[PDB]
Assembly symmetry: C2
Homo-oligomer: 94 residues x 2
């Protein structure tokens, strides 16, 4: 896995050089469906960086995240685990 | 608890059937600050199927679809954010 610095630097150059958003799907060990991207976003004559999560089935639907979202993500995982058997048995998902 | 969630699920299906639309309810998860879970009752040709989506509370269009099987992915994302917190907070 590349360092966060190696990623930010490369995307920043791409964004500056191409004057567009440059993104990379992050390779995080064990993450199988949810996609995590780093984005270099040109704005106000400089480059800004963001981290976003997506499905592998629609990238335009996304949530921007920061370390401050860590607890929320864990609480959601805990909810899913708590009710996993119930939901899988009681409802048909689409 | 499960008993409440069961009733919420049935009532959400009823609403979707009666109002001819997707009906949604935000799940009551204690301690959430920003990213909330929504249950959706989705009509498909006289059957109700369900979906779950997570959203930013400050902008519900910012969302992704999830299932119970995604618990591990969410924990791994959280753990990544924790491990690299200092760098991310400074350079994001």
């Amino acid at each position: 896995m590349a360092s966060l610095k190696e990623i930010i630097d490369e995307l920043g150059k791409q964004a500056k050089e191409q004057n567009k958003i440059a993104s990379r799907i992050m390779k995080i060990k064990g993450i199988k469906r949810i996609v995590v991207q780093l984005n270099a976003v040109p704005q106000d004559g400089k480059i800004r960086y963001s981290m976003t999560i997506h499905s592998q089935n629609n990238f335009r639907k996304q949530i921007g995240i920061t370390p401050q979202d860590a607890e929320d993500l864990k609480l959601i995982a805990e909810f899913l685990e708590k009710y996993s058997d119930f939901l899988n048995e009681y409802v048909k998902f689409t």
